[PDB]
Amino acid sequence: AFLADALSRVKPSATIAVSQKARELKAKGRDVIGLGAGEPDFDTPDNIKKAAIDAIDRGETKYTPVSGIPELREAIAKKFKRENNLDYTAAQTIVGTGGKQILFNAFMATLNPGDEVVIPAPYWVSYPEMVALCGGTPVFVPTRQENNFKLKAEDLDRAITPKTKWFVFNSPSNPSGAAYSHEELKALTDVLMKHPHVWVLTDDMYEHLTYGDFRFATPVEVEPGLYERTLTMNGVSKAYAMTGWRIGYAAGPLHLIKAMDMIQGQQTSGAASIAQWAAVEALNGPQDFIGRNKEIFQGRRDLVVSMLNQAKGISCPTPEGAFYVYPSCAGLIGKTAPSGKVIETDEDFVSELLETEGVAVVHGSAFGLGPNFRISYATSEALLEEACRRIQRFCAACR
Template structure:
């Protein structure tokens, strides 16, 4: 089996991060002392480094007190959702989107509604569609930028158009998942929600270090929220989860201080496999035109032409994924992201494996072509 389904890349741990973590271990060994335990909100120096980086990206008012470092991004995200959402709270999410949000919102007590976007216009989030989907009772809008699974990057102008709508809903919180912000192949850096006008003080960003900064497995994430909300989430974290380890935070601090260089190196590595996957998908039978995604290390491939028309869309999508698995290729079923008939494929894999996976996909799909 060759897996193109993993959300983690085949990236070496950055040398600066390893050196920083090693220094922490060496110090503990030399002092014959245990590792220190971090405050629940994170080491002050890491919180300040993250705040400084957001200020450099245009979020000029961001302070270290607004930043929380968490034991993985999911822990922080779930604490945030449980703090924001009352039972039955209305949550709106444009789809396709990361499959994890569905269950997380449910477990936090919310009721998730989707706003389906179309591949035909490259998943544009039209302001008029957003306005029609929002209600005065909607508590939270979730947007991923760059988007997982589509790789779509929403520009500064698109953010402005979205926020021109949300500002008319003063009780609405806007949450931007920006964990892939450093993996970008477009002409401009990925804009952060924190740099946008925030008249009601209800913008929140969640992020982490496992994607753009190659710290998969270190279990360290972060979120940035208005001060009152940040303090409430911090209190919830204190009551429910341990802090991120000082070892992981030392690595995260070094990665933050060298973020641009690390992300640039990852993009250079991915630039070798990205065209291989795009070309391989274009060579499949009946391949539709594909807009190359600007962000993440995924392509959200349209396989609807290979589905069994006699089955419901979700079942047909699952069947296609099972056929690929039987042929030796594991992918993420787009139905889990709100788009049956599509599949999320990662190109953050060795090139030899990717080429073999594409050859196997040809073998699976060629007999199904109409």
């Protein structure tokens, strides 16, 4: 037909559908609280704004090298050494239009029909969509809430086959907020060292959003033996409240970086020049924003964890990173919502919650693990408190 056969491999997005239903409820006058934000509710710090404005003033308005301006590729190589104790040259780095484009082109540069990509559940839904669009086969490995949504080494090992090309490792996790300690990650790298053909795609986007005394670690830092088959991907979107600017980056083996540069050159050429100069300042400038926001987010996390565990039938683990919680609604399965609807799935729970209380969350089965739902607490404490009060009232009314 006219559209590519490949598009049929991509399942419709439950997350966009939730945003759409919420938007429809607000349009007809309902008081809706959205709990699906994927971006901080803070503006970009002034120092980053000023650097962008400076680049505009100087006339940095021309095409950049496809893989990034040299100032930013250098800043990225230094960040990987300074923050993650990894050794990359600037030539091993690539700047994309979002971390999204890094992941997309890593897959488009590598996937052939029959290639498998191991994706732990719950997963960010864009991961299997990209793999499927690029023609690969997602292979999902479920985690369990009793293990705080973290992968068991034995489950990772069973999922790997000679057809496995990639293992996607996202810590801290969207949607669960789970974050692997050094020792938890070492158990997984020990498995990967037993399957040397499997490349590792590590999504470190939420590196700087971690709570308490948790210490972030990335796969090649934990296992240097993974250096020649890992793409270490990160970005400024979450850490620096720069989601709109679209700057992500990665570092890895030269032959992969060259292949992604070739595809990126056909797709977008380099990322917006002004946004790249902004990202240079984000990485090289003062880092006070990071510490300030850890405290703000930890308080929001604590509020939501406290309130959700008071709700009838709800159980909420305490996450260690990112700004998501992944509570279970297992205690409400089989009960009758206020509307009369029998709650048979987490999708029923979430759609009844939205209609009855105007609180918009995403059901866990959309991310590969239920009966659960995701809440993003990247919004005000007043809105979180009001939304959790409504969730408490809704759950108490289920019979």
